[PDB]
Write a protein that binds this ligand. Structure first.
Ligand code: CA
Length: 223
């Protein structure tokens, strides 16, 4: 997250870290056994880390759980990042508490100008590299479809939306992928892609979770 702030330990209790001997992507806890993340984060060997704040120190309130199943959307296209969504089933159910809690899926899609919270352990620099230890937060609005398509002509599908700031300086970035975009207590986005980070007129692009609610619920009911 570039231009953001230190969230505060366990203030984003649904945020997870996906780990393979290092943090590589985020995700969101949507019930005691299931996490949503981005398809482009898919790997073998994933450990889900819940209740994290500093990803480099064991502080308390952490739960480390292996992934059992990792379900990439069948129509994921890795060249376009259309359908950039994955479900991950935990080996065991997490213990939910004030520090470790699920986020609700949307009933309706969000509209333009809705303010959301994006969070992650990704790069904090637009130009260069600097990974945080502790979780970073950014409040960003949903842009209009118009401004989103004018920023990325031909590359925005019905399953995406833009969020952020056209002036630059505030965005998600590498390592934030897969994490939450929460608006009025509902999971509306997943950190997906963009052109660089925090660059002017190139806002971040997010998977529009409201298009996937039926798919999420049908897949989970069968797995
Ligand atoms: Ca920790």
């Amino acid at each position: 997250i570039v231009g953001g702030y230190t969230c505060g330990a366990n203030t984003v209790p649904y945020q997870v870290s996906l780990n393979s001997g290092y943090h590589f992507c985020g995700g969101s806890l949507i019930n005691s056994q299931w996490v949503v993340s981005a398809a482009h984060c898919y790997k073998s060997g994933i450990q889900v880390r819940l209740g994290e704040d500093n990803i480099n120190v064991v502080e308390g309130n952490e739960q480390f759980i292996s992934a059992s199943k990792s379900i990439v959307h069948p129509s994921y296209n890795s060249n376009t990042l259309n359908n950039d969504i994955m479900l991950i089933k935990l080996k065991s159910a997490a213990s939910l508490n004030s520090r470790v809690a699920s986020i609700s899926l949307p009933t309706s899609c969000a509209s333009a100008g809705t303010q959301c919270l994006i969070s992650g352990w990704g790069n904090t620099k637009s130009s260069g590299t600097s990974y945080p230890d502790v979780l970073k937060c950014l409040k960003a609005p949903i842009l209009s479809d118009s401004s989103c398509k004018s920023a990325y002509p031909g590359q925005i599908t019905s399953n995406m939306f833009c969020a952020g700031y056209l002036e630059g300086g505030k965005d998600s970035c590498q390592g934030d992928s897969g994490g939450p975009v929460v608006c009025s207590g509902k999971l509306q986005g997943i950190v997906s892609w963009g052109s660089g980070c925090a660059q002017k007129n190139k806002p971040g692009v997010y998977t529009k979770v409201c298009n996937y609610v039926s798919w999420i619920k049908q897949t989970i009911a069968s797995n």
